[PDB]
Design a protein around this ligand. Structure first.
Ligand SMILES: CC(=O)Nc1cc2nc(N)sc2cc1C
Ligand SMILES: CC(=O)Nc1cc2nc(N)sc2cc1C
Lengths: 208, 208
């Protein structure tokens, strides 16, 4: 039922660096996760241009932000292309090995952590604020899977039992105890407005 | 031998807006074309992770900048994934219709033209400096094609007779007469350094 995998060495390094480096500008995590969602939504849109049946799993193309103070979770949901089992195992469809190298050579030459997205490993910025991340995904060519990691060198993949989602990806951020500001409506709004105001898909901030 | 196609209405509008709007910060075109090249290079890299034979058409992953003062051309060459005939016809593999809408709603709300890349139509920024653009491309699943457009509502596609390129995409910018500064070594260097210093693939600026 549950497979456990080792992160590649470069990715494990990246995650340990995100977790342990003092860096106050943590809010960028949300920009990078919304930007990944927008990329994935572009992808199914593009595909549907030539094969409309691709959207039979769902025609609405949107991003939802869902805070939950009781579980201490912030979830980013999109109806993008989703990920197959293989994509999830391949560092979530990232070029994470070569991107991590290029990120850390960039950091050697004066970049800061907010430029992570430029190396195609912006996902891992989730670890600025989360002690654990759970990704639920469904791609048209595969079944629903759950990926999970509390970092520490390893992740899991299983088939996901819960609510079918039709098509796309849900990132559930189990927030660090001192990072609950990212569950507040006003804070989320500020951040979206500041860093993601022109995203071309509607972003709905859910209330509690 | 040569097929002629109409741009979609939204794209034709976009191109006319790029061509006719007064906007002094034209240099951004190069950032956006390098960023497209980096995306395409990421794509073949990703694909090769699971199928190494994808790189039989060429293992080197790089971007070349080639100025030619005699032809008044600036060419951006990459060894990325390339484009199939169908991608080229579909506005160069862009979501150009929905992206153009989102770009122009963004411009209504205070964005400037330099944010074009955020709507996935950054290619068309070529028209800030070029009176004509020629794209030569080769994808592993298809033959070599040449796309061309001087804007004006139409583009052409033909099979390309010339030098085989193995795999990737070449953008040839036939520069406007008053935009020859983008053929000068010092200028290209300044622009790459300013806007593309952390791209993760080597960028080679050719001399004349
Ligand atoms: C096939 C593909 O590109 N899948 C994909 C979807 C996706 N959705 C997100 N929200 S991050 C993400 C990453 C990948 C690779
Ligand atoms: C298949 C695919 O994504 N092709 C692709 C390659 C490409 N190369 C560039 N330099 S722009 C570009 C656009 C597309 C769609």
């Amino acid at each position: 039922e549950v497979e456990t995998f080792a992160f590649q060495a470069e990715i494990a390094q990246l995650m340990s660096l995100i977790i342990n480096t003092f860096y106050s500008n943590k809010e960028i995590f949300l920009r990078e996760l919304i930007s990944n969602s927008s990329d994935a939504l572009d992808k199914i849109r593009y595909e549907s241009l030539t094969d409309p049946s691709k959207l039979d799993s769902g025609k609405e193309l949107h991003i939802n932000l869902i805070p939950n103070k009781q579980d201490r979770t912030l979830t980013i949901v999109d109806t993008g292309i989703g990920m197959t089992k293989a994509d999830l195992i391949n560092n979530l469809g990232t070029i994470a090995k070569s991107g991590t190298k290029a990120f850390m050579e960039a950091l050697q030459a004066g970049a800061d952590i907010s430029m992570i997205g430029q190396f195609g490993v912006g996902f891992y910025s989730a670890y600025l604020v989360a002690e654990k991340v759970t990704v639920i995904t469904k791609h048209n060519d595969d079944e629903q899977y759950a990926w999970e990691s509390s970092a520490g060198g390893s992740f899991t993949v299983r088939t996901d039992t819960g609510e079918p989602m039709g098509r796309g990806t849900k990132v559930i951020l189990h927030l660090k105890e001192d990072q609950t500001e990212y569950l507040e409506e006003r804070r989320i709004k500020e951040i979206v407005k500041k860093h993601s105001q022109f995203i071309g898909y509607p972003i709905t901030l859910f209330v509690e």
